[PDB]
Amino acid sequence: ARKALIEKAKRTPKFKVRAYTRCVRCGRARSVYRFFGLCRICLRELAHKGQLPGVRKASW
Amino acid sequence: KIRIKLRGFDHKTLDASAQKIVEAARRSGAQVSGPIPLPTRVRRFTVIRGPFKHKDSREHFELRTHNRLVDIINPNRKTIEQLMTLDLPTGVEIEIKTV
Amino acid sequence: ARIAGVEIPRNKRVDVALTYIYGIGKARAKEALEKTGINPATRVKDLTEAEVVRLREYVENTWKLEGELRAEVAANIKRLMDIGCYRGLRHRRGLPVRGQRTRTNARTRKGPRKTVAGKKKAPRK
Amino acid sequence: GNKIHPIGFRLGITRDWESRWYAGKKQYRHLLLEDQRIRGLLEKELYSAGLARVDIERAADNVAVTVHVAKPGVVIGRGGERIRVLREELAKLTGKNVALNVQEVQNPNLSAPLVAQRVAEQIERRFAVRRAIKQAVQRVMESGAKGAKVIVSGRIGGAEQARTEWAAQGRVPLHTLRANIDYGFALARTTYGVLGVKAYIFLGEV
Amino acid sequence: EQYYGTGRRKEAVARVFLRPGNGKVTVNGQDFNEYFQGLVRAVAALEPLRAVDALGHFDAYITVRGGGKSGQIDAIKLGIARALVQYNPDYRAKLKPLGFLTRDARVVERKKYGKHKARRAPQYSKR
Amino acid sequence: PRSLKKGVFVDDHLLEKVLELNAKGEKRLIKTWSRRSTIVPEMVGHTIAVYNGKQHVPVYITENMVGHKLGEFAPTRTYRGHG
Amino acid sequence: GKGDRRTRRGKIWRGTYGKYRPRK
Amino acid sequence: ARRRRAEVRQLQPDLVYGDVLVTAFINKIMRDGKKNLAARIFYDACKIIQEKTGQEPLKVFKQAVENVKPRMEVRSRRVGGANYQVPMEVSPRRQQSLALRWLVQAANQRPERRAAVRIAHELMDAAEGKGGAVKKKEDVERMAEANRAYAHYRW
RNA sequence: CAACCCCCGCCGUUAGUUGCCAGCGGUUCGGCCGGGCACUCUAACGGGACUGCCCGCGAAAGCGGGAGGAAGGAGGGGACGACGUCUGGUCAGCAUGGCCCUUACGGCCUGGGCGACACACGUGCUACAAUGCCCACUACAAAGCGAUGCCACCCGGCAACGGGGAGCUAAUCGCAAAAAGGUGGGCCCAGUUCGGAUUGGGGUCUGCAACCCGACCCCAUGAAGCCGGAAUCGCUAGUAAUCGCGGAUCAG
RNA sequence: GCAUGUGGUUUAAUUCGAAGCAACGCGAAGAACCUUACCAGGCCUUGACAUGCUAGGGAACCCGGGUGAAAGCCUGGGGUGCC
Numbered sequence A: 001a002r003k004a005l006i007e008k009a010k011r012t013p014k015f016k017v018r019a020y021t022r023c024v025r026c027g028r029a030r031s032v033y034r035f036f037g038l039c040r041i042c043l044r045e046l047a048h049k050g051q052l053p054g055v056r057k058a059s060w
Numbered sequence B: 001k002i003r004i005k006l007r008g009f010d011h012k013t014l015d016a017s018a019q020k021i022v023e024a025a026r027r028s029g030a031q032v033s034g035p036i037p038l039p040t041r042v043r044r045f046t047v048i049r050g051p052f053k054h055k056d057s058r059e060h061f062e063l064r065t066h067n068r069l070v071d072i073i074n075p076n077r078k079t080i081e082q083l084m085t086l087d088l089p090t091g092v093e094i095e096i097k098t099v
Numbered sequence C: 001a002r003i004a005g006v007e008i009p010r011n012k013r014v015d016v017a018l019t020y021i022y023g024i025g026k027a028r029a030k031e032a033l034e035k036t037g038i039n040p041a042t043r044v045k046d047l048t049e050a051e052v053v054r055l056r057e058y059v060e061n062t063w064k065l066e067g068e069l070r071a072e073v074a075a076n077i078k079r080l081m082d083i084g085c086y087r088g089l090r091h092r093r094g095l096p097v098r099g100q101r102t103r104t105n106a107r108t109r110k111g112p113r114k115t116v117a118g119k120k121k122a123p124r125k
Numbered sequence D: 001g002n003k004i005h006p007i008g009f010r011l012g013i014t015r016d017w018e019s020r021w022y023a024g025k026k027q028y029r030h031l032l033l034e035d036q037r038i039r040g041l042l043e044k045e046l047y048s049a050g051l052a053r054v055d056i057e058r059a060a061d062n063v064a065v066t067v068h069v070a071k072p073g074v075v076i077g078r079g080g081e082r083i084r085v086l087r088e089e090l091a092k093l094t095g096k097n098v099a100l101n102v103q104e105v106q107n108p109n110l111s112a113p114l115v116a117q118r119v120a121e122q123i124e125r126r127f128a129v130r131r132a133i134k135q136a137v138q139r140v141m142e143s144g145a146k147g148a149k150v151i152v153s154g155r156i157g158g159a160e161q162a163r164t165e166w167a168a169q170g171r172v173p174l175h176t177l178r179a180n181i182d183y184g185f186a187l188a189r190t191t192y193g194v195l196g197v198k199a200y201i202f203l204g205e206v
Numbered sequence E: 001e002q003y004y005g006t007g008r009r010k011e012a013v014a015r016v017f018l019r020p021g022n023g024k025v026t027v028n029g030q031d032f033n034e035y036f037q038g039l040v041r042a043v044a045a046l047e048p049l050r051a052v053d054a055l056g057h058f059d060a061y062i063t064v065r066g067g068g069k070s071g072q073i074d075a076i077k078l079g080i081a082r083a084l085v086q087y088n089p090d091y092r093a094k095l096k097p098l099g100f101l102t103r104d105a106r107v108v109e110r111k112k113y114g115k116h117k118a119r120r121a122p123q124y125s126k127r
Numbered sequence F: 001p002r003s004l005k006k007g008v009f010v011d012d013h014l015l016e017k018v019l020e021l022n023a024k025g026e027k028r029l030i031k032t033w034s035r036r037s038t039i040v041p042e043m044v045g046h047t048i049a050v051y052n053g054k055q056h057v058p059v060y061i062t063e064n065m066v067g068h069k070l071g072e073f074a075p076t077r078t079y080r081g082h083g
Numbered sequence G: 001g002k003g004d005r006r007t008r009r010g011k012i013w014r015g016t017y018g019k020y021r022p023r024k
Numbered sequence H: 001a002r003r004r005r006a007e008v009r010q011l012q013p014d015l016v017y018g019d020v021l022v023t024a025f026i027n028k029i030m031r032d033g034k035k036n037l038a039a040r041i042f043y044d045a046c047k048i049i050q051e052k053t054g055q056e057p058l059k060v061f062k063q064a065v066e067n068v069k070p071r072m073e074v075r076s077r078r079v080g081g082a083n084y085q086v087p088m089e090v091s092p093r094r095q096q097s098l099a100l101r102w103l104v105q106a107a108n109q110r111p112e113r114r115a116a117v118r119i120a121h122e123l124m125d126a127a128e129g130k131g132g133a134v135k136k137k138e139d140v141e142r143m144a145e146a147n148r149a150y151a152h153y154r155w
Numbered sequence I: 001c002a003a004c005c006c007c008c009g010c011c012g013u014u015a016g017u018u019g020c021c022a023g024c025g026g027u028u029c030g031g032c033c034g035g036g037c038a039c040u041c042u043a044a045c046g047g048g049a050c051u052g053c054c055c056g057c058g059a060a061a062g063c064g065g066g067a068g069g070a071a072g073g074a075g076g077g078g079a080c081g082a083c084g085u086c087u088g089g090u091c092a093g094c095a096u097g098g099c100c101c102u103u104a105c106g107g108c109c110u111g112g113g114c115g116a117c118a119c120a121c122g123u124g125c126u127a128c129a130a131u132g133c134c135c136a137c138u139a140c141a142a143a144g145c146g147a148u149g150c151c152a153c154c155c156g157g158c159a160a161c162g163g164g165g166a167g168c169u170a171a172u173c174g175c176a177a178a179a180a181g182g183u184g185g186g187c188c189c190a191g192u193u194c195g196g197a198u199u200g201g202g203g204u205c206u207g208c209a210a211c212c213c214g215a216c217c218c219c220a221u222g223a224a225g226c227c228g229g230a231a232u233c234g235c236u237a238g239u240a241a242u243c244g245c246g247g248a249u250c251a252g
Numbered sequence J: 001g002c003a004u005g006u007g008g009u010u011u012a013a014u015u016c017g018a019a020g021c022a023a024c025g026c027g028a029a030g031a032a033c034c035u036u037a038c039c040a041g042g043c044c045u046u047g048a049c050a051u052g053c054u055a056g057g058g059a060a061c062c063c064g065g066g067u068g069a070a071a072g073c074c075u076g077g078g079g080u081g082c083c
């Protein structure tokens, strides 16, 4: 999550295919969930805080 | 004639709201097919717990969108004029299609 | 039953039998037994002498087969090396060609494993 | 790598979410990020007022941000001015009809997130860390509470050797699900580095 | 005129309808023996009758959905027993010995993370 | 291979330099970076230095080397053996 | 024969369809 | 089993003869939970047996087990030097279990091309007193009283 | 620790659509239509189990055995990790003390690399076949996913796929063939109708672009491998073994 | 035999961490360019991003040419709002 690449992330690029997601929070490139625009770290964190609505902890 | 779908995350509020609608349609002159429990669509998420390595521990989260149908056959006017005066739970979405 | 150069084996059904020729695999064979109209299920030693001839006609003439095919494949790789293209070098050095890993496996291309020395890891011995 | 976030565990059983709305896959992504931009700002702009929770309820193009605050005047402002400024700046960053109301945390001694903070400040202001804690836990039990616990961890004092201080009274049953247990976390930022304060407050068996 | 019993077994649900007469049996619009074409276990499904001696004194209209055919078998097999009692409450006495009224609680176990299979742990081998 | 509907791919700006070199009958060295370009029969007999990640290496184009892409003639990594 | 891309099993496992395991 | 003694599984009776032994054998034949194929390999092997002998396969079966059941065996003990091979008598169950296993294992050795036959033949041979089913019984019983010099290190 | 929470096993009450079909009316034989919610189910609240009952042992706690019961002695599985240990892991998620760079260790790009290969280990896939392999016909799942997408059905094509095009913001429309299984027929112990590496050739799709380095289809090639040395792993019941199915990330 | 990870070695670079159990289909729940942190080459220097400040020139913004692998570099025109 170097600063430039978070910005580059947003720049609509020369080709449709250099489209890639980062975390709306940390900017992490790698484990980013479509649906939240968050990584699997941030997901975990915000989920526990209670700030992802209707997101319960599973158990079956 | 009037068909109400009820989709929300919390099933207490979702179920409550649908009682507020089975009764609304009673005290206005009509018969009703009750609040029907449509199946519920779960979205799971399976995150590695730690930040770095350690793949052999995850945590399981889910996202449960609950679904209730309700039908009011023989739909009067004293019905509708008691429905656009309700709204009482926040995390419940309503969609009405006269089919 | 001498076709294409090689005696295909009797006792074995014709739909199989033809596989033993170079340019014939499962499909080309069963295509040939249609186009010449023959129950494939019958053994090779149970053929009309002229049934056999029909088979020899078709098979030997349409497809580029046997050592005559070994020719083209051979001189195809030969082209590639002479060209001096990547796939060329890979062919030359006896490495994989279609782009596999080489840090492990890649054995069918390099034959058996020429073990060499190596070092002492990780703490001491 | 030990204990579970006491809230997310109790969540849905004895503790509620800070955002309550529905959204399909299409919309959710952004109403989320929109909440986080709200909670990003009000958190910066209201540290002075001691703020516990930022509730975000939602309709359609409607947002009911309930802000839960120790000193509710500081949020309001003299004349009624400061709140108007927020509501406009909110409805700016949101571009929707922001409905910001204010709610008086009547007792900051039973708000974990606040107890946490009050300690962190104290730690930043260079106060004695051990005392700071016993005296916080103190104040918490004095006000009804059935159990409480504070954990400061990091470079305590100047300290080359980063250690951990902690203290508790009553019951703080982290395994008991029906236990209402408030958790809060504060981060103290210091010349020598950064330390973390967790505060657990056991509030009642349900 | 009929006697019902609802037999389930491990993601299978069987609907058993009993009507006295010959001995023939339909499952899902086919003959019992045509549905379970070459399954040995199949015969076991009609053990609840044979152990009260009412095989032949009945017919069966049955439907199953869910599970594999064997799962369906022990579900029918339950369902018939469940039905022989709505007909004759004294049959319980004959069936409970071999326990034909017992819902097999056994079912597929949740795959658990960090295993390959719920139990099948991944291999530790060498050092 | 490349789908047959969309023909073959050459970067317009390499194809450019050659047409000017052909429609003037000049045989002056070219340098490019686009390894990724196919080889139309228009390139034949020319010499193209191509990038291999470090330098441009000349690639005399003969007839038989047409179906391919330029990159096939400048390897990208350097190998000797293991010592 | 799950590695054999000329069988039903072959395509079953590769998740593809072909001559040797067609749709309808 | 460290706390309790493990309690033997009660098998379901066979679907044709009723003998639980039948089933026990069947299970040992099957693999990969392929119980249907197994039964078929069993019951078809009975047909060959009922054919080529005339009597009842159930009993040729229940006989071919007595003639593979080993009356005692060697187990292992280590004392004060190394490991002297110790003899020791074999329980009710362990006999029955060793038998079924050995029947199948060496039935599967036979040259016969087809399974049902291979079972049918070994299930016949052994039922008489020949074939490597018994020769691996007459083996574990051999070492029973060939190392009876060490038969005082017992448990 | 246990318990309060979730899932599974039995029954209840409320609920009848997009689910269900038991008797009945009409049928183009499709629950298709009438009609009905019985049943299945769906999913929200509840009941039920306490060593309660009987026998035996025991001061007691509790243990063994039996009866009724769907379930019996924690009924099966989950979530839940004590004070602390490891100067454990991570400054490359984020945050942060201190040190270091600032026309360079910052930033943009194009190309290359992370994919290199005398070799060695770790985890796994597919096999070495007849309790199998191939071809055809014929059954029985669950859980998810999808209106920028899933793509039914018609057409061209050996096929990947392409052109046309209906339904579906989805218990309705779709992905969707479940595979093992069943019935028929083939092969007959063979490096084979076992195995499907490797390579030659011809195509498809995505993508600005498949040389380095994509997957897929078809033809041809048909390597090692005939059950693995010393060592060594997993699992105690719906478990192991075996067989398919879905999803996240994702143009691929 | 092949798929992946790793040790090593090689390389202009083979980015980096993980190292007995508790590293090794692990961070990676998606490396052709992007990702991308490495290498080569061509580029920018209040900068791709924040809040400003002193001095001059400008409405903001919109479209076209040259050169170039792109980035960048040079250049032409339209436009005059608000207090």
Ligand SMILES: NC(=O)OC[C@@H](O)C[C@H](NC(=O)[C@H]1NCCC[C@@H]1O)C(=O)N[C@@H](Cc1cnc(N)[nH]1)C(=O)N[C@H](C(=O)O)[C@H](O)c1cnc(Cl)[nH]1
Pocket (backbone or CB within 6 Å): C123, C124, C125, E127, J020
């Ligand atoms: N985690 C752990 O405890 O060890 C487990 C296992 O890996 C051991 C490991 N074993 C092997 O390699 C063997 N296994 C098969 C391959 C080769 C080899 O034969 C090993 O390396 N042994 C020697 C080697 C050696 C001979 N000479 C120097 N300098 N080293 C060693 O290094 N001992 C150390 C010591 O002498 O202090 C070590 O720190 C130790 C302290 N206490 C004990 Cl006990 N061990």
Ligand SMILES: [Mg+2]
Pocket (backbone or CB within 6 Å): A001, A002, A003
């Ligand atoms: Mg940073």
Ligand SMILES: [Mg+2]
Pocket (backbone or CB within 6 Å): A017, A018, A019, A020
């Ligand atoms: Mg991408």
Ligand SMILES: [Mg+2]
Pocket (backbone or CB within 6 Å): B057
């Ligand atoms: Mg764990």
Ligand SMILES: [Mg+2]
Pocket (backbone or CB within 6 Å): D002
């Ligand atoms: Mg601890």
Ligand SMILES: [Mg+2]
Pocket (backbone or CB within 6 Å): D153, D164
């Ligand atoms: Mg700590």
Ligand SMILES: [Mg+2]
Pocket (backbone or CB within 6 Å): E108
């Ligand atoms: Mg399973």
Ligand SMILES: [Mg+2]
Pocket (backbone or CB within 6 Å): E108, E109, E110
């Ligand atoms: Mg389950």
Ligand SMILES: [Mg+2]
Pocket (backbone or CB within 6 Å): B055, E122
């Ligand atoms: Mg693993």
Ligand SMILES: [Mg+2]
Pocket (backbone or CB within 6 Å): none
């Ligand atoms: Mg698997």
Ligand SMILES: [Mg+2]
Pocket (backbone or CB within 6 Å): F012, F013
């Ligand atoms: Mg150009």
Ligand SMILES: [Mg+2]
Pocket (backbone or CB within 6 Å): G001, G004
């Ligand atoms: Mg094959």
Ligand SMILES: [Mg+2]
Pocket (backbone or CB within 6 Å): H002, H003
């Ligand atoms: Mg003991």
Ligand SMILES: [Mg+2]
Pocket (backbone or CB within 6 Å): none
């Ligand atoms: Mg009728």
Ligand SMILES: [Mg+2]
Pocket (backbone or CB within 6 Å): none
């Ligand atoms: Mg109807």
Ligand SMILES: [Mg+2]
Pocket (backbone or CB within 6 Å): none
């Ligand atoms: Mg319940």
